[PDB]
Amino acid sequence: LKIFFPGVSEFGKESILFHYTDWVDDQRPENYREALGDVVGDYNFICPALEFTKKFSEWGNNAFFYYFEHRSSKLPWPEWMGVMHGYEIEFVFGLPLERRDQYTKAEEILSRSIVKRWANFAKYGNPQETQNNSTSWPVFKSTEQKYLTLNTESTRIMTKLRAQQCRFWTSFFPKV
Amino acid sequence: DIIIATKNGKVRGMQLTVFGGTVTAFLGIPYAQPPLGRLRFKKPQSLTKWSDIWNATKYANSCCQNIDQSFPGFHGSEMWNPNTDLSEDCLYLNVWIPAPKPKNATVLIWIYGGGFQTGTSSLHVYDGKFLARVERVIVVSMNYRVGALGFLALPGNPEAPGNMGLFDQQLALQWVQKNIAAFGGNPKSVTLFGESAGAASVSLHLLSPGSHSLFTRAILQSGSFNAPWAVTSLYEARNRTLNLAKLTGCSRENETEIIKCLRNKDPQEILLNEAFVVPYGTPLSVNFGPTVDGDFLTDMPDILLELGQFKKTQILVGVNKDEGTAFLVYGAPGFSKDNNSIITRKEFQEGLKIFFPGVSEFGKESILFHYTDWVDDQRPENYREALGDVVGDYNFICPALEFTKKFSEWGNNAFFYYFEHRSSKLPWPEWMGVMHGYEIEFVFGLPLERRDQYTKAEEILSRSIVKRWANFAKYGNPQETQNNSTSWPVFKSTEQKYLTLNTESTRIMTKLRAQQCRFWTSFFPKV
Amino acid sequence: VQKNIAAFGGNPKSVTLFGESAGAASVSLHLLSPGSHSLFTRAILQSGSFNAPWAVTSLYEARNRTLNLAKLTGCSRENETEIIKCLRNKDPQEILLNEAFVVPYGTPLSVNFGPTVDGDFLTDMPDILLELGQFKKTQILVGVNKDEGTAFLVYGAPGFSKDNNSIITRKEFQEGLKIFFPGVSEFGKESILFHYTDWVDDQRPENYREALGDVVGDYNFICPALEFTKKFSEWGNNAFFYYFEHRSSKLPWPEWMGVMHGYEIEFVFGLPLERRDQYTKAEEILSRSIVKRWANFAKYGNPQETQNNSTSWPVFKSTEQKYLTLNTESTRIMTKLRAQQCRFWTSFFPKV
Amino acid sequence: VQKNIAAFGGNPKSVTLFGESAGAASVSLHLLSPGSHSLFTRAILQSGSFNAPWAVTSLYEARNRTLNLAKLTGCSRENETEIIKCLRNKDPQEILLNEAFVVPYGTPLSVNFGPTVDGDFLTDMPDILLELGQFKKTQILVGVNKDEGTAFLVYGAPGFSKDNNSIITRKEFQEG
Numbered sequence A: 001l002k003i004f005f006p007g008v009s010e011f012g013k014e015s016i017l018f019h020y021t022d023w024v025d026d027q028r029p030e031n032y033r034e035a036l037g038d039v040v041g042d043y044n045f046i047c048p049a050l051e052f053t054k055k056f057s058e059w060g061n062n063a064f065f066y067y068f069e070h071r072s073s074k075l076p077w078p079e080w081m082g083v084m085h086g087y088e089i090e091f092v093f094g095l096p097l098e099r100r101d102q103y104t105k106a107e108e109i110l111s112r113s114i115v116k117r118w119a120n121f122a123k124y125g126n127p128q129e130t131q132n133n134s135t136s137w138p139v140f141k142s143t144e145q146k147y148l149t150l151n152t153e154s155t156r157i158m159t160k161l162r163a164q165q166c167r168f169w170t171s172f173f174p175k176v
Numbered sequence B: 001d002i003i004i005a006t007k008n009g010k011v012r013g014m015q016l017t018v019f020g021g022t023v024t025a026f027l028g029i030p031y032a033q034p035p036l037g038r039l040r041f042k043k044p045q046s047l048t049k050w051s052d053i054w055n056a057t058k059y060a061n062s063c064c065q066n067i068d069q070s071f072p073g074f075h076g077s078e079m080w081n082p083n084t085d086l087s088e089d090c091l092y093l094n095v096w097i098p099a100p101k102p103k104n105a106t107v108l109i110w111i112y113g114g115g116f117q118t119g120t121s122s123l124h125v126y127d128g129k130f131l132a133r134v135e136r137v138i139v140v141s142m143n144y145r146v147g148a149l150g151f152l153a154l155p156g157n158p159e160a161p162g163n164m165g166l167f168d169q170q171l172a173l174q175w176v177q178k179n180i181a182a183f184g185g186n187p188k189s190v191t192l193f194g195e196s197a198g199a200a201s202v203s204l205h206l207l208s209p210g211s212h213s214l215f216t217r218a219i220l221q222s223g224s225f226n227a228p229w230a231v232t233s234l235y236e237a238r239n240r241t242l243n244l245a246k247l248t249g250c251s252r253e254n255e256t257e258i259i260k261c262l263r264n265k266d267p268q269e270i271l272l273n274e275a276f277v278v279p280y281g282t283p284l285s286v287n288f289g290p291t292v293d294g295d296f297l298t299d300m301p302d303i304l305l306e307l308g309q310f311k312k313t314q315i316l317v318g319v320n321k322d323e324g325t326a327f328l329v330y331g332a333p334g335f336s337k338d339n340n341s342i343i344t345r346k347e348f349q350e351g352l353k354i355f356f357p358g359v360s361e362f363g364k365e366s367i368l369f370h371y372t373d374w375v376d377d378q379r380p381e382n383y384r385e386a387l388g389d390v391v392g393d394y395n396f397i398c399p400a401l402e403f404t405k406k407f408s409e410w411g412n413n414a415f416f417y418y419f420e421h422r423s424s425k426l427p428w429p430e431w432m433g434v435m436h437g438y439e440i441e442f443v444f445g446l447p448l449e450r451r452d453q454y455t456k457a458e459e460i461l462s463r464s465i466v467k468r469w470a471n472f473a474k475y476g477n478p479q480e481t482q483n484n485s486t487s488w489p490v491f492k493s494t495e496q497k498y499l500t501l502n503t504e505s506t507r508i509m510t511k512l513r514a515q516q517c518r519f520w521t522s523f524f525p526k527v
Numbered sequence C: 001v002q003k004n005i006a007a008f009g010g011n012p013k014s015v016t017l018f019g020e021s022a023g024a025a026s027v028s029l030h031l032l033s034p035g036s037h038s039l040f041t042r043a044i045l046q047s048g049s050f051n052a053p054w055a056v057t058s059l060y061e062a063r064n065r066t067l068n069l070a071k072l073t074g075c076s077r078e079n080e081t082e083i084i085k086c087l088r089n090k091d092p093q094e095i096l097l098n099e100a101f102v103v104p105y106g107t108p109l110s111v112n113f114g115p116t117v118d119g120d121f122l123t124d125m126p127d128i129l130l131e132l133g134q135f136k137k138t139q140i141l142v143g144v145n146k147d148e149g150t151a152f153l154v155y156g157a158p159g160f161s162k163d164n165n166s167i168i169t170r171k172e173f174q175e176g177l178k179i180f181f182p183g184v185s186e187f188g189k190e191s192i193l194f195h196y197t198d199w200v201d202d203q204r205p206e207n208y209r210e211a212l213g214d215v216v217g218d219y220n221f222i223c224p225a226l227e228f229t230k231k232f233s234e235w236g237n238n239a240f241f242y243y244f245e246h247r248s249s250k251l252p253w254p255e256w257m258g259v260m261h262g263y264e265i266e267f268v269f270g271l272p273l274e275r276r277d278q279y280t281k282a283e284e285i286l287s288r289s290i291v292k293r294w295a296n297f298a299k300y301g302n303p304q305e306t307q308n309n310s311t312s313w314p315v316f317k318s319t320e321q322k323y324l325t326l327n328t329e330s331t332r333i334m335t336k337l338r339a340q341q342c343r344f345w346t347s348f349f350p351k352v
Numbered sequence D: 001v002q003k004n005i006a007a008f009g010g011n012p013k014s015v016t017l018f019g020e021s022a023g024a025a026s027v028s029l030h031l032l033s034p035g036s037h038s039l040f041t042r043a044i045l046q047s048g049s050f051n052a053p054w055a056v057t058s059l060y061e062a063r064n065r066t067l068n069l070a071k072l073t074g075c076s077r078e079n080e081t082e083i084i085k086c087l088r089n090k091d092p093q094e095i096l097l098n099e100a101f102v103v104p105y106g107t108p109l110s111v112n113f114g115p116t117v118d119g120d121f122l123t124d125m126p127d128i129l130l131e132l133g134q135f136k137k138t139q140i141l142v143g144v145n146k147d148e149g150t151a152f153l154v155y156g157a158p159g160f161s162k163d164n165n166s167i168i169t170r171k172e173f174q175e176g
């Protein structure tokens, strides 16, 4: 927290510790390791993308929100680092469609589907995959806040990503 | 020394230290006349009544039943086998009360499952003293007749009317109505709870008018009467009663004669022939079950369900994530608890023959068609997982979900959960996942016992489940209100929200098994 | 009263309980207690409700305290019916004399011996019973005074006096939190400072003095009365909320202490109607009107004054949270009393 | 009627009260009176209701009037059960003969002796009971005639006559 929150009142920093370190339960050794990645993801990327989308949807337009959770079979960084920043890009660009290239079947399939959702958004303003019986992607609204999860297995409709955490980043933290 | 007087006499209990506190157990109080001799096959009768003091200081006999000998010495299976002598004289219940004696406690009544062919209320995973210690509810459980001796039917004939074991359950709920206030219980706050056939049972007490005023609310674990194994048609029932007659040389012409004959056979001989009252059978066979007898159950229950005829009150229904896995190692070629059971396509096809005996060929292909088109053809355990899903979704998940929708459509609050924690202590192999039966121990509180080798995360999950169940029972709402817990929505026809139970985060999701139950529920019933 | 009141001319079918501070907490628990459910019709809650932090004792602390008392009166025993039998021999003065010490730190708002979940009057933690809608369904009138917290500061907060104006410093405020929030993580306490001390602006000398009264009012009385009323209204019944803000012309405590705890009681009881008694005209008028709203609630379940063109008192709902202000000038409909502060007490603080 | 009407063939469970002017006012107060609440089913109100300005007497004026009556019949006493005991001796004609004067000014619509809040038939001011919804819940039929006020003008308004057309002047209206 000192490295990531340089200046940064002491009470600021304790309050992050307080939010992120009361768990269920004190047993697991990688508790602190995961918590620091979450501080940094939720603060820097996730809560602000979610609040942009809410504020933006409140004025009228259709928005769609996704939550990417596939780890690339070819990722060169270690396991503990999980579904990292930057590592959807290659799915979006279609790199796994290139069979010649050592991605799983499941990965080609995920990619082909992402590519089609993105290209449908661009041409039609709706990111559905309409042909292959795909889970329907709801619009995100202030109220239910539905999002779609992207993974090689089943993709799901969920609600209110990081609800408790963004209540911290978004209402309280900006005050410290 | 703890004596309590009942309509029928006095009973003494025993004290138990649980988590630095005390609970009083009254084990084996009888609750009907033993059903022997002239009573075998008949509705349970009035407990006659004793002076002196009954000691309810041990579990009583389990009803007569066949045992599982597939894996002798294996805890996985043997933990389900009865653990007190078998005997026709098995109509007893247990009561567990908090100490000090509560003043007007809510009552949880457990109905064990066992396929209607087996089970006993004295299993360790059904021990009610954690609930009573931790939530200061009272817990009652009953032994009820199972197999032919509890569900033999020759319809209309009171010598064997059918549903005998369902009326033993019923007479136990009457016994709590009459007697529980003496142990400190509120008879106006009773929740029935049960797993698999015991859940099916709970669901039929919701339909049965004679039960309508013996309880307040209902919990349904991995089971409901619209499951395909839960009710026997009047056709098959007489076929089976007479096939049994045949097999014990009792075929007669007078039907009160067949029964009179059958009432002479030794127990072992009835048990020994039960398995064969039926030409093909399967690992999920229920040869002797509930039937529409015109008494406990006045019409086909699917009609009663659809047309809104059932007790109006709240229900909590749930299923486990891998319900179907446990039955595959009882007969599906390729499957073993002792290896990882990667079966082939041709083996999967054979599996459907075992699980869907008769069973048009187009029926079976259509299951294959639904379950085997994947994303993608690569993974070796593709066929192994698909067969467990056929069996879970067909037998448990889709029918529990359709019960809950039909039931919620008439007005009452329902809650649905989806249990997906695998017990750190599970003795069956990994590939078998979150198995059938393996929530029970979380619900009963076994992991609260620290002394016992469950994870921290498991104690926490348990303590929370126990509190949701006890809140449902007392308040009709299964929230955990104190520890910032995810709020459990009611299930409605429309959004169909459910809550997932796991050691990590619990989530609100929608429309469990949507594509699969569209198959089981609309199309399959037609084949 | 159920058994006997009809003899004095009373209707046992029309009973309203009313009470202030612990007496209000009491009223609130009779709403939860099944044994009370049929001994009254409606409820009034003045400056108090059982979810206040001083109103219910945990079973843990209760035995600790009963045995600390046993200790202190040399009655520690091994048989518990023995501790009691012993304690039943001590003279009154000796029990009273040790009550204060059954507890290590204590505070000006200590409640060493209070209500507990006994399995009899109170069958479960009352916060659970509240949340899950288990309580008598009937109308409630709830209120708080504008300066609830002031009266307790002159019992222990360094810098405070009834005999001067108590302009305390920042460091004194910090010390005050130590007196009022004894144990009480350091981060707990800073977070209260953080919430209550960022102002507009750093100029006014009585900044810290006012902030400490607000910590104590909002925490101990106002936020819990407002959350009781929301939770309660969510299940269906009409509730009315008031915000009393008149300072008695006869108040004997100093000005800086404002509209204190306890000082609506006399308006509610009608004391200012007694002309002979040195209250203002405006005060008689306020009283006569309060008395009529309270008596209309009791008989009719609606606290209106219907005759003298009075401001209409809305019901309080989760959503708009309307309340009525009681003062000698105009009484107003407002919304969401202490919104930002109770968001602190109610969602965040319970976590520290 | 509750006790006896079934003998004449009546349904005591189907009773409608009906009335005109003070009889309508009366019907309206039986709607407010708890002792009447179970002696009828429904109510008709013709040209009258208790919130009319002539229909209820304030406790103030009522004692003033009772004592003005006492005065006028030489019955003023000090014991009030004495005033009554006295008044219970006067002949009928003498009470009637003084009723008109229990009151300083009066008008063609005077009601010198009417309903009052007695704590018995009528437990509070009826306007309060009305506003706050305390009254028998059942259907009501209410009506008025088109020229209600005309009949009282020929009892005192200067210019008015039943025997001519009463075209009065502005100054006469003012006197009225």
Ligand SMILES: *[C@@H]1O[C@H](CO[C@H]2O[C@@H](C)[C@@H](O)[C@@H](O)[C@@H]2O)[C@@H](O[C@@H]2O[C@H](CO)[C@@H](O)[C@H](O)[C@H]2NC(C)=O)[C@H](O)[C@H]1NC(C)=O
Binding pocket: B239, B243, B244, B246, B247, B276, B277, B278, B279
């Ligand atoms: C209703 O029962 C008959 C009876 O058949 C049985 O005789 C019993 C004593 C028992 O031993 C049982 O296993 C044996 O089969 C069933 O008839 C049988 O059906 C199968 C296939 O349909 C034939 O191969 C058998 O030969 C035939 N047996 C006899 C003796 O007729 C009948 O199938 C059953 N109904 C259903 C729907 O299961």
Ligand SMILES: *[C@@H]1O[C@H](CO[C@H]2O[C@@H](C)[C@@H](O)[C@@H](O)[C@@H]2O)[C@@H](O[C@@H]2O[C@H](CO)[C@@H](O)[C@H](O)[C@H]2NC(C)=O)[C@H](O)[C@H]1NC(C)=O
Binding pocket: B332, B333, B334, B335, B336, B338, B339, B340, B341, B342
């Ligand atoms: C996993 O085991 C199954 C189960 O059957 C066997 O259990 C094994 C551990 C095995 O060694 C033997 O003791 C027992 O029969 C194996 O399937 C079996 O394979 C044979 C061919 O030998 C069939 O003809 C058997 O009937 C068949 N059993 C069943 C249940 O149909 C299975 O091959 C094995 N697979 C592995 C190791 O992946």
Ligand SMILES: *[C@@H]1O[C@H](CO[C@H]2O[C@@H](C)[C@@H](O)[C@@H](O)[C@@H]2O)[C@@H](O[C@@H]2O[C@H](CO)[C@@H](O)[C@H](O)[C@H]2NC(C)=O)[C@H](O)[C@H]1NC(C)=O
Binding pocket: C064, C068, C069, C071, C072, C101, C102, C103, C104
């Ligand atoms: C539960 O009570 C103990 C008992 O401590 C007390 O002994 C009592 C008779 C009484 O006189 C009391 O004031 C005295 O403290 C509390 O233990 C105390 O805790 C504090 C700080 O935690 C220590 O400084 C004391 O030395 C310690 N005393 C002893 C004798 O152990 C305990 O704190 C209390 N629980 C709570 C949460 O308040």
Ligand SMILES: *[C@@H]1O[C@H](CO[C@H]2O[C@@H](C)[C@@H](O)[C@@H](O)[C@@H]2O)[C@@H](O[C@@H]2O[C@H](CO)[C@@H](O)[C@H](O)[C@H]2NC(C)=O)[C@H](O)[C@H]1NC(C)=O
Binding pocket: C157, C158, C159, C160, C161, C163, C164, C165, C166, C167
């Ligand atoms: C307002 O008074 C407080 C209260 O304490 C005092 O009451 C005064 C009127 C004072 O004269 C004395 O009789 C009594 O102690 C004053 O604070 C006090 O100041 C001293 C430093 O002298 C501290 O060490 C005292 O403990 C402290 N009292 C408390 C309650 O902590 C306060 O300074 C005074 N301030 C004014 C006049 O603005």
Ligand SMILES: *[C@@H]1O[C@H](CO[C@H]2O[C@@H](C)[C@@H](O)[C@@H](O)[C@@H]2O)[C@@H](O[C@@H]2O[C@H](CO)[C@@H](O)[C@H](O)[C@H]2NC(C)=O)[C@H](O)[C@H]1NC(C)=O
Binding pocket: D064, D068, D069, D071, D072, D101, D102, D103, D104
């Ligand atoms: C309450 O009653 C008094 C009594 O006055 C009356 O004496 C009665 C016996 C009767 O004869 C009546 O007509 C006579 O007036 C009323 O007081 C009177 O008020 C008027 C004008 O206010 C004066 O001109 C009278 O002189 C005065 N009379 C006396 C003897 O005091 C009083 O007005 C009344 N209240 C109301 C509001 O009508």
Ligand SMILES: *[C@@H]1O[C@H](CO[C@H]2O[C@@H](C)[C@@H](O)[C@@H](O)[C@@H]2O)[C@@H](O[C@@H]2O[C@H](CO)[C@@H](O)[C@H](O)[C@H]2NC(C)=O)[C@H](O)[C@H]1NC(C)=O
Binding pocket: D157, D158, D159, D160, D161, D163, D164, D165, D166, D167
């Ligand atoms: C209509 O008649 C009124 C009523 O008064 C009178 O009734 C008449 C028919 C009249 O002849 C007489 O017998 C009786 O007084 C007339 O008003 C009257 O006019 C006089 C002036 O003479 C006044 O001083 C009277 O007091 C006044 N009466 C009243 C009721 O105040 C009215 O003028 C008459 N108008 C017409 C014909 O249009």
Ligand SMILES: *[C@@H]1O[C@H](CO[C@H]2O[C@@H](C)[C@@H](O)[C@@H](O)[C@@H]2O)[C@@H](O)[C@H](O)[C@H]1NC(C)=O
Binding pocket: B103, B104, B186, B188, B189, B216, B474
């Ligand atoms: C015990 O409580 C009785 C009723 O309580 C219940 O009301 C039911 C309808 C049901 O909702 C239950 O869950 C409620 O708890 C009451 O009538 C008895 O008189 C009570 N007897 C006691 C307190 O000993």
Ligand SMILES: *[C@@H]1O[C@H](CO[C@H]2O[C@@H](C)[C@@H](O)[C@@H](O)[C@@H]2O)[C@@H](O)[C@H](O)[C@H]1NC(C)=O
Binding pocket: C011, C013, C014, C041, C299
């Ligand atoms: C006195 O009134 C009785 C009932 O009055 C009440 O109805 C209650 C449910 C409650 O709303 C109260 O506030 C109402 O005022 C009635 O049944 C008695 O019989 C009455 N006895 C008398 C008139 O002496």
Ligand SMILES: *[C@@H]1O[C@H](CO[C@H]2O[C@@H](C)[C@@H](O)[C@@H](O)[C@@H]2O)[C@@H](O)[C@H](O)[C@H]1NC(C)=O
Binding pocket: D011, D013, D014, D041
């Ligand atoms: C006469 O009818 C009785 C009731 O009729 C009434 O129901 C009331 C609530 C009210 O709506 C009336 O207007 C209805 O007509 C019935 O209970 C009696 O038993 C009947 N006795 C007879 C037929 O002689």
Ligand SMILES: *[C@@H]1O[C@H](CO)[C@@H](O)[C@H](O)[C@H]1NC(C)=O
Binding pocket: A109, A112, A113, A116, A129, A131, A132
């Ligand atoms: C549709 O699925 C097929 C296989 O059935 C495959 O050819 C392709 O990946 C899919 N089209 C899209 C947009 O995903």
Ligand SMILES: *[C@@H]1O[C@H](CO)[C@@H](O)[C@H](O)[C@H]1NC(C)=O
Binding pocket: B054, B055
């Ligand atoms: C019942 O158990 C008690 C408890 O020790 C004993 O005293 C009594 O004789 C017992 N009666 C039996 C076993 O019949």
Ligand SMILES: *[C@@H]1O[C@H](CO)[C@@H](O)[C@H](O)[C@H]1NC(C)=O
Binding pocket: B460, B463, B464, B467, B480, B482, B483
């Ligand atoms: C609340 O969580 C605490 C730890 O903070 C623990 O004592 C207990 O397991 C919880 N209560 C319930 C019902 O889960």
Ligand SMILES: *[C@@H]1O[C@H](CO)[C@@H](O)[C@H](O)[C@H]1NC(C)=O
Binding pocket: C285, C288, C289, C292, C305, C307, C308
């Ligand atoms: C109505 O106001 C009047 C003065 O106009 C006064 O007599 C009294 O205080 C009022 N009644 C009520 C209930 O306030």
Ligand SMILES: *[C@H]1O[C@H](CO)[C@@H](O)[C@H](O)[C@H]1NC(C)=O
Binding pocket: B254, B256, B257
């Ligand atoms: C058949 O015979 C016996 C006679 O003992 C009897 O029990 C049974 O009811 C009879 N029924 C008929 C009419 O066939």
Ligand SMILES: *[C@H]1O[C@H](CO)[C@@H](O)[C@H](O)[C@H]1NC(C)=O
Binding pocket: C079, C081, C082
């Ligand atoms: C402790 O001893 C006394 C005996 O007089 C008694 O009052 C109390 O209940 C006893 N309890 C136990 C079993 O320790």
Ligand SMILES: *[C@H]1O[C@H](CO)[C@@H](O)[C@H](O)[C@H]1NC(C)=O
Binding pocket: D079, D081, D082
């Ligand atoms: C007044 O005197 C008479 C005595 O005969 C009586 O009727 C009335 O009640 C008395 N009241 C009082 C105490 O003045």
